[PDB]
Amino acid sequence: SGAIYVGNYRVVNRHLATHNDWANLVWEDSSRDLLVSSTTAQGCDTIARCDCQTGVYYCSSRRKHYPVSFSKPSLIFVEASEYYPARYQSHLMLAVGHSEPGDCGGILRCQHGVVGIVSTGGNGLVGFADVRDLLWLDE
Protein backbone atom coordinates (compact mmCIF):
# COMPACT_ATOMS: atom_id res chain seq x y z
CA SER A 1 0.00 0.00 0.00
CA GLY A 2 1.14 3.52 -0.87
CA ALA A 3 1.28 5.94 -3.78
CA ILE A 4 2.55 9.46 -4.71
CA TYR A 5 -0.04 11.93 -6.00
CA VAL A 6 1.62 14.84 -7.86
CA GLY A 7 -0.55 16.93 -10.20
CA ASN A 8 -2.48 14.68 -12.58
CA TYR A 9 -0.27 11.63 -11.79
CA ARG A 10 -0.49 8.63 -9.45
CA VAL A 11 2.94 6.91 -8.88
CA VAL A 12 2.87 3.30 -7.63
CA ASN A 13 5.07 0.16 -7.34
CA ARG A 14 4.44 -1.48 -10.76
CA HIS A 15 4.04 -4.93 -9.03
CA LEU A 16 1.10 -3.49 -6.98
CA ALA A 17 -0.63 -1.59 -9.85
CA THR A 18 -4.41 -2.08 -10.32
CA HIS A 19 -6.43 -2.57 -13.58
CA ASN A 20 -7.26 1.20 -13.38
CA ASP A 21 -3.53 2.06 -13.25
CA TRP A 22 -3.06 -0.07 -16.43
CA ALA A 23 -6.17 1.33 -18.25
CA ASN A 24 -4.84 4.90 -17.62
CA LEU A 25 -1.08 4.06 -17.99
CA VAL A 26 1.28 7.01 -18.67
CA TRP A 27 4.67 5.21 -18.19
CA GLU A 28 5.85 1.93 -16.60
CA ASP A 29 9.31 0.31 -16.01
CA SER A 30 9.66 -3.24 -14.53
CA SER A 31 13.44 -2.65 -14.04
CA ARG A 32 12.50 0.17 -11.59
CA ASP A 33 9.24 -1.38 -10.22
CA LEU A 34 7.39 1.86 -11.19
CA LEU A 35 4.14 2.65 -12.90
CA VAL A 36 2.64 6.04 -13.34
CA SER A 37 -1.13 6.28 -14.13
CA SER A 38 -3.30 9.30 -14.91
CA THR A 39 -5.78 10.75 -12.36
CA THR A 40 -8.81 13.04 -12.45
CA ALA A 41 -8.07 14.90 -9.17
CA GLN A 42 -5.08 17.29 -8.60
CA GLY A 43 -2.47 15.59 -6.35
CA CYS A 44 -0.48 17.84 -4.04
CA ASP A 45 2.72 15.92 -3.14
CA THR A 46 5.95 17.89 -3.82
CA ILE A 47 8.79 15.95 -5.50
CA ALA A 48 12.36 16.55 -4.29
CA ARG A 49 14.89 17.56 -6.99
CA CYS A 50 18.16 16.98 -5.08
CA ASP A 51 21.05 14.59 -4.15
CA CYS A 52 20.07 14.05 -0.48
CA GLN A 53 21.29 10.94 1.29
CA THR A 54 19.34 11.33 4.55
CA GLY A 55 15.60 11.37 5.04
CA VAL A 56 12.49 9.88 6.74
CA TYR A 57 10.32 7.00 5.50
CA TYR A 58 6.96 5.66 6.68
CA CYS A 59 6.96 1.95 7.86
CA SER A 60 3.40 0.52 7.89
CA SER A 61 4.48 -2.77 9.59
CA ARG A 62 5.43 -0.65 12.69
CA ARG A 63 3.00 2.32 12.09
CA LYS A 64 6.16 4.50 12.43
CA HIS A 65 8.21 7.07 10.44
CA TYR A 66 11.99 6.36 10.70
CA PRO A 67 15.02 8.58 9.98
CA VAL A 68 17.48 6.82 7.53
CA SER A 69 20.70 7.34 5.61
CA PHE A 70 20.40 5.99 2.14
CA SER A 71 22.63 5.21 -0.83
CA LYS A 72 22.75 6.86 -4.29
CA PRO A 73 20.36 5.52 -7.01
CA SER A 74 21.88 2.33 -8.47
CA LEU A 75 21.51 -1.23 -10.02
CA ILE A 76 21.06 -3.81 -7.24
CA PHE A 77 20.42 -7.56 -7.47
CA VAL A 78 16.90 -8.46 -6.27
CA GLU A 79 16.08 -12.16 -5.69
CA ALA A 80 13.22 -13.80 -7.64
CA SER A 81 9.62 -13.06 -6.46
CA GLU A 82 6.05 -14.01 -7.62
CA TYR A 83 6.03 -10.66 -9.58
CA TYR A 84 9.51 -10.75 -11.16
CA PRO A 85 12.27 -13.21 -12.08
CA ALA A 86 15.71 -12.73 -10.37
CA ARG A 87 17.22 -9.53 -11.91
CA TYR A 88 19.01 -6.18 -11.25
CA GLN A 89 16.57 -3.36 -10.30
CA SER A 90 17.84 0.10 -11.35
CA HIS A 91 17.46 3.47 -9.54
CA LEU A 92 17.30 1.59 -6.17
CA MET A 93 18.57 3.16 -2.90
CA LEU A 94 19.34 1.06 0.20
CA ALA A 95 19.12 2.07 3.90
CA VAL A 96 19.55 0.30 7.21
CA GLY A 97 15.96 0.00 8.51
CA HIS A 98 13.08 -2.38 9.25
CA SER A 99 10.71 -3.32 6.40
CA GLU A 100 8.31 -6.15 5.49
CA PRO A 101 6.66 -7.02 2.05
CA GLY A 102 3.48 -5.04 2.92
CA ASP A 103 5.70 -1.96 3.38
CA CYS A 104 6.04 -1.30 -0.40
CA GLY A 105 4.67 2.15 -1.31
CA GLY A 106 5.70 3.87 1.94
CA ILE A 107 7.05 7.29 1.07
CA LEU A 108 10.71 8.33 1.62
CA ARG A 109 11.00 12.15 2.16
CA CYS A 110 13.77 14.72 2.84
CA GLN A 111 13.48 18.53 3.50
CA HIS A 112 13.18 19.03 -0.34
CA GLY A 113 10.17 16.77 -0.88
CA VAL A 114 9.30 13.24 -1.94
CA VAL A 115 12.40 11.15 -2.73
CA GLY A 116 10.85 7.78 -3.57
CA ILE A 117 8.87 4.79 -2.27
CA VAL A 118 9.73 1.42 -0.51
CA SER A 119 10.13 -1.25 -3.20
CA THR A 120 12.53 -3.89 -1.68
CA GLY A 121 13.91 -4.87 1.79
CA GLY A 122 15.02 -7.72 4.09
CA ASN A 123 17.86 -8.70 6.50
CA GLY A 124 17.70 -5.31 8.28
CA LEU A 125 17.78 -3.28 5.00
CA VAL A 126 15.14 -1.26 3.05
CA GLY A 127 15.24 -0.41 -0.67
CA PHE A 128 13.53 2.67 -2.20
CA ALA A 129 12.70 3.23 -5.92
CA ASP A 130 13.89 6.80 -6.65
CA VAL A 131 11.65 9.32 -8.54
CA ARG A 132 13.78 12.57 -8.35
CA ASP A 133 15.03 12.10 -11.96
CA LEU A 134 11.44 11.95 -13.41
CA LEU A 135 11.24 15.67 -14.21
CA TRP A 136 8.03 15.24 -16.37
CA LEU A 137 5.95 14.66 -13.18
CA ASP A 138 5.99 18.49 -12.62
CA GLU A 139 5.09 19.52 -16.20
Residues assigned a catalytic role:
15, 33, 104
Residue 6 binding partner per list Zn ion, ligand A1B4L, none, with a CB distance cut-off of 5 to 8 Å that depends on partner kind: none
The distance of closest approach from Cβ of residue 17 to ligand A1B4L in the complex, given in angstroms and rounded to an integer, is 12
Long-range contacts of the stretch 74-79 (C-beta < 8 A, 24+): 76/120, 76/127, 78/120, 78/127
Q: Is 52 in the site for Zn ion (CB under 5 A)?
A: yes
Sign of the C-alpha dihedral computed for residues 35, 121, 106 and 75 taken in this order: negative
Q: Which is nearer to ligand A1B4L, 67 or 101 (CB)?
A: 101
The item of ligand A1B4L, Zn ion, none sharing an interface with residue 28, based on CB under 5 to 8 Å by kind, is none
| Surface-to-core class of residue 112, CB atoms within 10 Å of its CB (0-12 exposed, 13-18 middle, 19+ buried) | middle
Question: DSSP H helical segments within the chain, as ranges?
Answer: 19-23
- Interacting partner of 119 out of Zn ion, ligand A1B4L, none (Cβ under 5 to 8 A depending on kind): ligand A1B4L
**Is 36 or 39 the residue whose CB approaches ligand A1B4L more closely?**
36
